[PDB]
């Protein structure tokens, strides 16, 4: 098994006013997006130390009673409104992974998409504040911290494609974004149940099978345990870990709108018997956001692909990923 070229890109100029320097970042994003599809964003400004600390404290202290009380509908029939947000239980002996997903903190009973019961919009559920002091505040501020990083990365992608720097970010708004954070725990288990391990076609033991991301882009922090592999024509390649940088890649919505000039890379999660953390931020737009496709490889730049409304893309994509790779 070979190793993916995953360049480390200093993205801090995307926060600044040096336009030529932003173009030099944009070039690097273009190159990475045309090669393996991945890059590490470094010099990003986010306190990833605290993020890993607060997440571990939550995972290791939440009780079975709290997990039922917060469980999504797939684990608790009482919670019919929780399709996306809430706790995703492990099944000891069968399923090792467990996680907690939350959405836009601005999705409240006051929000018109909650009032209208629009699919993919939900009000976040939270544990008792006194049982998990500071957790909700941490989690909501992390959402906006990584929102700000993601908005800057979207400026880099727009420039990389020959667009004005707000081409994507103008659709990425705090009042309506469908973006999600998932706080994933992968446990150490002894013995590790074979029922929780899948075997790939090439024989590799996996915790999660191949898939394209359902996102515009994916902004991922993981603890320092190597596990990801990207598919290339030469086979699956190991993605090296970096627990200070953010692993970035395009989702299938970007592959659609660029006429596949920036492909959505296929990745999978190797089985590793180790306590670790996987904390993705899925950069989703608003429910009615439509980006007109284009083809940066054509002289006239024209694409015949349908402009796709993002909310319907997200709803169909999330169900499809569950049907293909199982309920997480
Ligand atoms: C590969 C990582 C990003 C991570 N996998 C994942 O997060 C996988 C594959 S991208 N993602 C999903 O299943 C979609 C979660 C969507 C979320 N409930 C929501 O409603 O928005 C892992 O470590 O398993
Ligand atoms: Fe993925």
Swiss-Prot record:
Transmembrane segments: none annotated. Fe(2+) binds at residues 211, 213, 267. Isopenicillin N binds at residues 84, 88, 180, 186, 278. 2-oxoglutarate binds at residue 276. InterPro entries: DIOX_N, IPNS-like_FE2OG_OXY, IPNS-like_sf, Isopenicillin-N_synth_CS, Oxoglu/Fe-dep_dioxygenase_dom. N-[(5S)-5-amino-5-carboxypentanoyl]-L-cysteinyl-D-valine binds at residues 84, 88, 180, 186, 211, 213, 278. Changing residue 228 to I/V: Strongly reduced the catalytic activity. One of its GO terms (cellular component) is cytosol. Binds 1 Fe(2+) ion per subunit. It catalyses: N-[(5S)-5-amino-5-carboxypentanoyl]-L-cysteinyl-D-valine + O2 = isopenicillin N + 2 H2O. Keywords: Antibiotic biosynthesis, Cytoplasm, Iron, Metal-binding, Oxidoreductase, Vitamin C. Its cofactor is Fe(2+). Its main location: cytoplasm. SUPFAM superfamilies: Clavaminate synthase-like. It is found in: Cytoplasm, Cytosol. Coiled coil: none annotated. Residues 173-285 form the Fe2OG dioxygenase domain. The record marks 208 as: Transition state stabilizer. Pathway: Antibiotic biosynthesis; penicillin G biosynthesis; penicillin G from L-alpha-aminoadipate and L-cysteine and L-valine: step 2/3. PANTHER family: 2-OXOGLUTARATE (2OG) AND FE(II)-DEPENDENT OXYGENASE SUPERFAMILY PROTEIN, OXIDOREDUCTASE, 2OG-FE II OXYGENASE FAMILY PROTEIN. Isopenicillin N synthase; part of the gene cluster that mediates the biosynthesis of penicillin, the world's most important antibiotic. IpnA catalyzes the cyclization of the tripeptide N-[(5S)-5-amino-5-carboxypentanoyl]-L-cysteinyl-D-valine (LLD-ACV or ACV) to form isopenicillin N (IPN) that contains the beta-lactam nucleus. The penicillin biosynthesis occurs via 3 enzymatic steps, the first corresponding to the production of the tripeptide N-[(5S)-5-amino-5-carboxypentanoyl]-L-cysteinyl-D-valine (LLD-ACV or ACV) by the NRPS acvA. Monomer. Belongs to the iron/ascorbate-dependent oxidoreductase family. This is Isopenicillin N synthase.
